[PDB]
Amino acid sequence: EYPTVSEIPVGEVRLYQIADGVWSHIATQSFDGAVYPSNGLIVRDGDELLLIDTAWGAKNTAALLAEIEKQIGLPVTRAVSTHFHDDRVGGVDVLRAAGVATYASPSTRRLAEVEGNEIPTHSLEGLSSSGDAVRFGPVELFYPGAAHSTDNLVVYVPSASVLYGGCAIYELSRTSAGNVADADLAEWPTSIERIQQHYPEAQFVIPGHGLPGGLDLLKHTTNVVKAHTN
Ligand SMILES: [Zn+2]
Ligand SMILES: [Zn+2]
Ligand SMILES: [Zn+2]
Incomplete structure (x- = not known):
């Protein structure tokens, strides 16, 4: 049922409804x-929507907004x-031009600027600081520590028990490390354990790429990261 590249x-x-008021975009x-x-x-936010992450590029992200406008309205x-x-x-520039308020941590904004990326x-x-959590409307934002990147955040939707791990969490089908150029391999397992300890009640876990699963995706990712390290 979950959309693949095919x-x-x-x-x-494509949009995929995970739970009431929660979708993933692919x-x-x-x-x-x-x-x-x-x-x-x-994530539904009253009569508005909160978006987590772009659709990877300007054209994709404009397509994202049109698909949201068409399907959720x-x-x-x-x-x-x-x-x-x-x-x-x-x-992000496309979101901004469309009247969307774009947000990131100062850590992320700094690194985006150094990279020459959109900010x-x-x-x-x-x-x-690792272990920091803040509320952002219908979600909690959590900085677990450095992992896939030094600034990576994960996102929890408490009303739906959905944990969005982004690129700090690997799908099960990925049995080898991905792009780890900016990763902290030494800290990544410790950061994953912070996620485990903070959201032990999560029922759905969404990786940055690929198929959703349960909390076993966290142990999966630790397994793959340790194999790469060694
Ligand atoms: Zn603003
Ligand atoms: Zn990345
Ligand atoms: Zn990624």
């Missing part, structure tokens, strides 16, 4: 040779990028 033409976006992008999918999240008022890479902030406008305070 069902998503390049430049198109887009595709061509890396050198292969095509990769990418997940973000949509509620306005996207805020967006949060969960780290500084292009599959998370690429398309979310607003800053999320209170997330600078």
Whole structure:
């Protein structure tokens, strides 16, 4: 039932309802040779919507907004990028031009600027130390520590028990480390354990790329990270 690359033409976006008032958005992008999918999240926020992460690029993200407008028909008022890479902030300029308030931690904004990437406008305070959590409307934002990147955030929807791990969490089908150029391999397992300890009640876990699962995706990711380390 969950959308794969097979069902998503390049430049198109699919939505998938995870639970009441929670959706994931799925887009595709061509890396050198292969095509990769990418997940973000949509969370109902009263009569508005909170967006988690772009659809990886300007065209994809405009397609994302059109697909939201068509299927849910509620306005996207805020967006949060969960780290500084292009599959998370690429398309921020498109969101901004459409009247969406874009948000990221100062850590993420700093690293985006150094990378020459798009920079979310607003800053999320209170997330600078590992284990920090802040409320953002219908979600909790959590900084577990450095993992896939030094700034990576995860997002929990308490009304639906949905944990969005972004790129700090691997899908089960991924049995080898991905792009770890900006990762902290030494801290990644410790950061995953912080997620485990903070959200032991999570029922759905969404990786940055690929199929949703349960909390076993956390142990999976630790397994793969330790194998890469060694
Ligand atoms: Zn990344
Ligand atoms: Zn603003
Ligand atoms: Zn990623």
